[PDB]
Every structure is written in C-alpha cells, then in structure tokens.
C-alpha cells in the first residue's frame, strides 16, 4: 500500500532503542503533547517548548531528546539528515513513524505565546523574501492559484485553504523518483537549493519558521501520512 512503511517501522525501532552514553530510548521524549505521547504531536508541530525556550519542529525536537535523554551523538545526523541508496536516515524514519501516530488527525498548530507568533511572522516574511541571482521567493511559485511549473501544478501556499491543507497532509511523503521517504527539512533544502540560495542549515531557525507558516496556512488539513508521490 506504500513503500514508505519501512521508515515507519524503522522509526518505531529507534524510538524503542536505547542509545547514547545514558543509553536510554526516546520512549520518554516529550514532543509537545506530554512525555512519550506520540498521538497528534506532528499535527501540532512546529511549536514552543519551555525546556529550550523557543519554537521547534519535529527534527529539532528529536535531536534535543537524543542529546539530553539518550545522550546520542547527533553530530553525524545533522551532517547526513537525508538518506541515500544503501543508507537510511534515522531522521526521516522517526518522522515517518511519529507522523503516522498523527495519521487521521487534523493539522492544528496554534499561536499561543510571544515566541510562536513572532516565529510565524518571520516565516511569512521568509516566504515573501526575494534574494539571490534568480530573485526567487517561495511566493514567486506559490503566490497564486491554477499555475504550474512545466507540467507540475503549483499549490497555493500564500493563503489558507485547500492546496496548503492537502500539501502538509501529504508530508512527510514517499517520492518514487528517488525511492526515498522525505521530510519537510529536505523539501526546504531542495527548494532553497533550486532558488540558487546557499544550502540552509538542517533543523535551522529559518526552516522551522517557514514550516509553522505553511502548517498554519494548512489548518484543518487532515493528515494522511506518509503519502505516495
């Protein structure tokens, strides 16, 4: 029914698997919905975490847990966050699994503090921001309806409504043309890559700022994750 159900079941392993100097699993990792509780947590991500004092996506959160809870050496992961042929990504698998624990749920981020409203704003700004040799912005290709790049149609993401909901409901997803499950991080990387920008930092501020905007414009979208593309 979907080749992206490996990552689902590979992410299940790592969540169970004790690792690090402290050698515990991420079964007690808090994702916003309380410790251990996986249900709907991605449908409410990115969000503010009191234990750091900032807004955070799924990956920035996992990584935090790896550091403090597990004591896992995250440095090799922030370096190879996106899988290859013959090499998984324990950052794309734990996203598949955690995302699937939010399957059938509706996307529901909320601007509830000074940190989250500020983040969203800055993400709105980064969405419109023109820069570099091609002058592109995301809003250049997501700034209207019924438009397509070559043969592939474009989702409207500068407004609330259908396209956006459906988009964030179809991420993370499995792309066959790469035969790999991919996360919002990689998409953010791929799009800045093709905007002729420098390569954004994996799990950086800018990426997570964008995601919140995209996810807030996606409100109501009923997660069907991980998808086939």
């Amino acid at each position: 029914a979907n080749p992206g159900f490996l990552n689902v079941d590979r992410g299940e392993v790592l969540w169970s698997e004790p690792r690090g100097t402290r050698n515990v699993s991420l079964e007690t990792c808090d994702l916003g919905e309380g410790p251990g509780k996986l249900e709907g947590a991605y449908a409410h991500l990115p969000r503010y975490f009191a234990d750091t004092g900032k807004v955070m996506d799924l990956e920035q959160r996992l990584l935090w847990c790896m550091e403090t809870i597990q004591g896992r050496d995250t440095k090799p992961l922030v370096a190879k966050p996106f899988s290859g042929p013959g090499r998984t990504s324990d950052m794309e698998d734990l996203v598949a699994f955690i995302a699937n624990k939010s399957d059938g749920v509706k996307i529901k981020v909320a601007l509830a503090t000074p940190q989250e409203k500020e983040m969203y704003a800055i993400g709105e700004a980064l969405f419109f921001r023109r820069s570099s040799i091609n002058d592109f912005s995301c809003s250049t290709c997501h700034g209207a309806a019924g438009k397509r790049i070559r043969l592939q149609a474009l989702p409207q993401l500068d407004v609330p409504g259908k396209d956006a909901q459906l988009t964030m409901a179809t991420w993370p997803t499995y792309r066959v043309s790469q035969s790999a499950l991919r996360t919002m991080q990689h998409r953010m990387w791929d799009m800045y890559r093709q905007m002729r920008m420098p390569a954004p930092d994996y799990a950086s501020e800018a990426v997570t700022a964008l995601t919140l905007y995209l996810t807030k414009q996606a409100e109501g979208g009923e997660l069907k994750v991980p998808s086939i593309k």
Binding site: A125, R130, R196, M197, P198
Partner: protein, 180 residues
C-alpha cells in the same frame, strides 16, 4: 500593523552558515529585491516607478544587433541547471523559459506562471524594434515591470549578452518553431 522586524536578517544570517566561496552576497537583498519582499510582490504605483528608474539604467545593450542564434537559444530555453551549490563547476546556465512559459507550440511540457510566448515574433510582425523590447525584457524585466516574477537574467549574471541574443532569437527568428 504586524510590523515584521529586522529579526529576519539574523534568522537568515544564523540559519545559512554553510556558504560556498563568495555566497554571503546571495543573502543580501538589493534595493529592488527588498521592496518586492516587504510588499508581497504588490508594489504601489510610486514604488513600482522608482524600481523601473533604477532597473532600466542597469540595462546594457549589445554592440551589434539584438538577434543571435535561435538554435542555440533553444538550448538556453531548455537548460534548468546553473548557479546552484549542487551544480558542479563549469555548469552553463540557462534561462529555463520553459519552466514558466509556453514556447514551441509543438512542445507539451511548459509552465503557466508566465505568459504564452508562442508566435511572439510573428504576432509582433518580426519587428526589429519589438525585439529590442524583448531583449531588455530578458536582460532586466523589472526595468519594464516592477516586482515581476521573471528573473532579471542579464543584470544578475545568469545570462550572458550572447545568451540573451540567442534566446531572443528563439522568440524572434522567423524560422524558429516558436514562430511556426
């Protein structure tokens, strides 16, 4: 208003730390990048006007004619590689017009973010003067329309004078599939 602060710089500055040699510049907006971003690509009349004044002066025209090579212009139109960090050194850049435009009427893969350019030359009676207009449009589009979604190809160093000569020919050379 939700006055968005200069906290956008840091968020970029601090989130874009892996930079290929000489790419810090790719983060800093020029004054016509900055207006188009702060107004969501909706300039006001006065806003649009100032841009045009600064953009149309930046346009250099060729020492010789406008028209170049439509057969080599077709190559500029189809190439969507170039400028990327993922791009190996020596990668020849294109204008990639096909991404956003219909060009060869026979061709079936084309975007609809930009205007149909099918028969552009024929529709403009192959006028040598309207080709100057199409040249200065490719060299710098924001010279004629402020905050336009077409890349300022020639002013941003993506297209060479000669490539623009070549891609314009593709729109204007009567013997091109675009004009047939």
């Amino acid at each position: 208003s939700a006055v968005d602060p200069a906290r956008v710089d840091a968020v970029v500055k601090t989130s874009f730390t892996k930079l290929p040699e000489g790419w810090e510049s790719r983060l800093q907006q020029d004054e016509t990048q900055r207006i188009c971003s702060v107004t969501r690509n909706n300039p006001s009349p006065e806003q649009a006007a100032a841009i045009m004044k600064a953009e149309e002066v930046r346009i250099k025209f060729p020492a010789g004619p406008v028209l170049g090579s439509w057969k080599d212009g077709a190559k500029v139109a189809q190439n969507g590689r170039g400028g990327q960090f993922s791009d190996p050194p020596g990668t020849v850049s294109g204008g990639n017009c096909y991404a956003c435009h219909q060009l060869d009427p026979k061709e079936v893969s084309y975007g609809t973010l930009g205007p149909s350019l099918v028969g552009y030359g024929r529709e403009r009676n192959f006028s040598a003067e309207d080709a100057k207009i199409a040249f200065a449009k490719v060299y710098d589009a924001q010279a004629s329309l402020a905050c336009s979604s077409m890349p300022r190809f020639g002013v941003n160093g993506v297209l060479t004078e000669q490539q623009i000569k070549d891609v314009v020919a593709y729109l204007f050379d009567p013997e091109s599939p675009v004009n047939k």
